[PDB]
Design an enzyme around this catalytic site. Structure first.
Site, PDB file in Angstrom:
ATOM      1  N   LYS A   1       0.917  -1.320   0.325  1.00  0.00           N
ATOM      2  CA  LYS A   1      -0.134  -0.024  -0.460  1.00  0.00           C
ATOM      3  C   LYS A   1       0.708   1.595   0.346  1.00  0.00           C
ATOM      4  O   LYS A   1       1.431   2.053   0.081  1.00  0.00           O
ATOM      5  CB  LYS A   1      -1.309   0.412   1.206  1.00  0.00           C
ATOM      6  CG  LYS A   1      -0.236   0.574   2.572  1.00  0.00           C
ATOM      7  CD  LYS A   1      -1.595   0.583   2.903  1.00  0.00           C
ATOM      8  CE  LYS A   1      -1.981   1.478   4.564  1.00  0.00           C
ATOM      9  NZ  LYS A   1      -0.876   3.191   3.800  1.00  0.00           N
TER      10      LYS A   1
ATOM     11  N   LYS B   1       7.068   2.812  -0.063  1.00  0.00           N
ATOM     12  CA  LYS B   1       7.081   1.495  -1.159  1.00  0.00           C
ATOM     13  C   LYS B   1       7.954   1.956  -2.173  1.00  0.00           C
ATOM     14  O   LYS B   1       9.164   1.669  -2.955  1.00  0.00           O
ATOM     15  CB  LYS B   1       5.785   1.355  -1.771  1.00  0.00           C
ATOM     16  CG  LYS B   1       6.094  -0.329  -2.539  1.00  0.00           C
ATOM     17  CD  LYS B   1       4.319  -0.625  -2.982  1.00  0.00           C
ATOM     18  CE  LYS B   1       4.410  -0.611  -4.518  1.00  0.00           C
ATOM     19  NZ  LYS B   1       3.932   0.720  -4.963  1.00  0.00           N
TER      20      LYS B   1
ATOM     21  N   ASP C   1      -1.819  -1.385  -4.729  1.00  0.00           N
ATOM     22  CA  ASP C   1      -2.548  -2.328  -3.885  1.00  0.00           C
ATOM     23  C   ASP C   1      -2.864  -4.037  -4.053  1.00  0.00           C
ATOM     24  O   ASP C   1      -3.732  -4.426  -3.447  1.00  0.00           O
ATOM     25  CB  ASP C   1      -3.765  -1.436  -2.976  1.00  0.00           C
ATOM     26  CG  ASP C   1      -3.357  -0.435  -2.374  1.00  0.00           C
ATOM     27  OD1 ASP C   1      -3.125   0.444  -2.613  1.00  0.00           O
ATOM     28  OD2 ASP C   1      -3.652  -0.648  -0.626  1.00  0.00           O
TER      29      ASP C   1
END
Ligand code: SF4
Ligand code: SF4
Lengths: 271, 271
Positions: B10, B15, B128
């Protein structure tokens, strides 16, 4: 028999107030309707239900952590004129996408039997595209009619053209057509003509010009439709004219989408 | 030969900084990489490119209104250690979805020939879910390896479990597996163990614990990776350990996703 219609268009132009007010005007003349909210921001039924919000299939699912373990009356509630209301959409609070949440919702409804015999109309309040998970409310055993809500605004019209490219590029030759363009007003007598101009460019019709009137916001803060709140208002007869036009409409077309060069030309010519 | 990896997880957990810093640590040891940003919020390449933002395929397309009329060097630019960068994602400024914009982008790349002979790694920074338009960077002639970035936070882990359900429910028996769980730290020695605990529950490994260190934010406001900005930092050797572990990794598994009752149990047991 049960016609299946679906309302596409972009957000922020009042598409969901128009949908509810048309559905209420249909309830009022004798029609039996179900509204099915296929919107991530699930809010297509509060005016028919007089709701703070309606609990969604994709929120009563993860809540009870299901596979095949929820009931119909836990999600399909009746409201003004006996209109039946369903919400689906959003993962909210959980993660993911809401487009798939439309498929894991009208599938619930089919298997649950909500499409009964005297239902005249099923309305899908969906969004900006006719693709995959949001085109599902329009495939084989589903919506055969599509009405696009737009207005005299660049992005609104560009979304009406792009929803039209998705109707022509649908997964082979089933039947889902374009019923018309509903226009949600913002200004005087050269905005209705601009949407009529785009309608004729794509090979449809502007099936109604919904005027900007204050009774509408006064009805939606009080959580009702104008048909319910002030049946005697002039705007109340706008949604009746729209409703009769939707009932009686036969021009269901396969649209001929324009270039964004052509749409630049139309918007240059207007504003 | 050219391994194709893809980073899911997410938003808001960092990330994309982890992806760039791992890619830079790979560039640095001799590997030849391409980063392909499949993110709506297209920002997976600014640290390798030292960019304000990188122009997307789905923004240089509508701009030049194309069908089959854009070039490769108009979108694939090189950066630190010779890493090649592509952005795609967003309709922004136009309307629609960005999931489809991933398919009308890596298709551009294939037909344009960016997957050349000495490319060791292609990295897809996606989001996601592993579904339709965002599972496309993982089908037949694509990603065979999937690494999930998460952390010791309810929603982050719930997204790691749901991305895992999408890897098992992929469109029949092709080969796309789960390489591991990268964890982006927030707290001390019982967070790495929680992700190790989820890893073992789903049948993978926590392939690395990326610590929380300040050099990282100091490198990203200066638009670089820690490998470029401070090669001598301790955190710089975190991304090298992660990189060597990704290069050398062989456990590519088909994950066994847990119930949100089981994940409730794990989070109760930790915090
Ligand atoms: S894709 S979970 Fe054009 Fe939805
Ligand atoms: S759907 S334009 Fe699960 Fe994207």
């Amino acid at each position: 028999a049960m016609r299946q219609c679906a309302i596409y268009g972009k957000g922020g132009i009042g598409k969901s107030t128009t949908t509810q007010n048309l559905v209420a005007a249909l309830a009022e003349m004798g029609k039996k309707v179900m509204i099915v909210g296929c919107d991530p921001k699930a809010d297509s039924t509060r005016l028919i239900l007089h709701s703070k919000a309606q609990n969604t299939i994709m929120e009563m699912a993860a809540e009870a952590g299901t596979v095949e373990d929820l009931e119909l009356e836990d999600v399909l509630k009746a409201g003004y004129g006996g209109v039946k209301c369903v919400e689906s959409g959003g993962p909210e609070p959980g993660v993911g996408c809401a487009g798939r949440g439309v498929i894991t919702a009208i599938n619930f409804l089919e298997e649950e039997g909500a499409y009964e015999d005297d239902l005249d109309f099923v309305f899908y309040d969906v969004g900006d595209v006719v693709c995959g998970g949001f085109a599902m409310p329009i495939r084989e055993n589903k919506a055969q009619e599509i009405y696009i809500v737009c207005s005299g605004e660049m992005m609104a019209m560009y979304a009406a053209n792009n929803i039209s490219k998705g109707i022509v590029k649908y997964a082979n030759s089933g039947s889902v057509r374009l019923g018309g363009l509903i226009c949600n007003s913002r200004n005087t007598d050269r905005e209705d003509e601009l949407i009529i101009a785009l309608a004729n460019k794509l090979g449809t019709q502007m099936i109604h010009f919904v005027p900007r009137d204050n009774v509408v916001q006064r009805a939606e803060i009080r959580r009702m439709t104008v048909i319910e709140y002030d049946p005697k208002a002039k705007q109340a007869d706008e949604y009746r004219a729209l409703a009769r036009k939707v009932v009686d409409n036969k021009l269901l077309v396969i649209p001929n989408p324009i270039t964004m060069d052509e749409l630049e030309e139309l918007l240059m010519e207007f504003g």
